[PDB]
Structures are given as structure tokens and as C-alpha cells.
Amino acid sequence: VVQRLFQVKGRRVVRATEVPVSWESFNNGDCFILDLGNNIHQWCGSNSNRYERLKATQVSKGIRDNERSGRARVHVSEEGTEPEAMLQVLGPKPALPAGTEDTAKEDAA
Ligand SMILES: [Ca+2]
Incomplete structure (x- = not known):
């Protein structure tokens, strides 16, 4: 059973990082990819930035095309x-927190 969740966060350096499969991983400032195998859920918060939404598409389509040989379908929400x-896996959605600053220019990135 494939269930994975990625947090997609950053501005000039956007990374996708695997996090626990839970609504507690989400925030309204980033994008998230809930990978359910033959279906991949691309979710972006209201305060996600354009570089995160773009990279969320790259990651979801890269899982689809490179890991699933094109077989999976990406769904944007x-x-x-x-x-x-999504709700069947994660449960009912709670109130979500804000994100943190995306730029961390002096820190290893
Ligand atoms: Ca963000």
C-alpha cells in the first residue's frame, strides 16, 4: 500500500520532503503531495507561493511519469x-496553521 506525503516548501530553493501522513503535517502556506499510488493528490494552501505550486506539479508529475510509468492520475485540490x-486517508480536516518563512538565505538549504 503506497501512502506517502510530501511537503513542498521554499521560494528560490524549493524542496519536497517526505513527512508523516497526517493533517498535522499540513499548513496553509505550502503545498503538499499525498501519494496514494494510482492517484496522487496535489494540494496547495491559500498562502503557498507560485514557486511551491510549480514545484508541486513537477513532483506529482515526476512520481506519475518516473515512478508509476505514467499510470497514475494527479488531482489538484x-x-x-x-x-x-484524501479525507478517507487523513480523516476530517482540522483548522490548519500558517506556514513559516520560506527563505532561509544564510542556512544550509
Ligand atoms: Ca510557503
């Missing part, structure tokens, strides 16, 4: 439009 399939 946002807060309040989550597909039933």
Missing part, C-alpha cells in the same frame, strides 16, 4: 475542496 479519497 486546495483547502475545502479536498477529494473524498
Whole structure:
């Protein structure tokens, strides 16, 4: 059973990092990829930036094309439009926190 969650965060340096499969991983300032195998859920918070939304597409389509040999379908959603399939895995959505600053220019990135 494939269930993975990626946090997609940054501005000039955007990274996708695997995090625990939980609503507690989400915030409204980043994008998240909930990978369910033959379906990949691309979710972006209201305060996600354009570079995160772009990279979320690259990651979801890269899983689809490179890991799943094109077989999977990517579905785009946002807060309040989550597909039933997402809620079946994560449970009902709680109130979500804000993100943190994306730029960390002096820190190893
Ligand atoms: Ca962000």
C-alpha cells in the first residue's frame, strides 16, 4: 500500500520532503503531495507561493511519469475542496496553521 506525503516548501530553493501522513503535517502556506499510488493528490494552501505550486506539479508529475510509468492520475485540490479519497486517508480536516518563512538565505538549504 503506497501512502506517502510530501511537503513542498521554499521560494528560490524549493524542496519536497517526505513527512508523516497526517493533517498535522499540513499548513496553509505550502503545498503538499499525498501519494496514494494510482492517484496522487496535489494540494496547495491559500498562502503557498507560485514557486511551491510549480514545484508541486513537477513532483506529482515526476512520481506519475518516473515512478508509476505514467499510470497514475494527479488531482489538484486546495483547502475545502479536498477529494473524498484524501479525507478517507487523513480523516476530517482540522483548522490548519500558517506556514513559516520560506527563505532561509544564510542556512544550509
Ligand atoms: Ca510557503
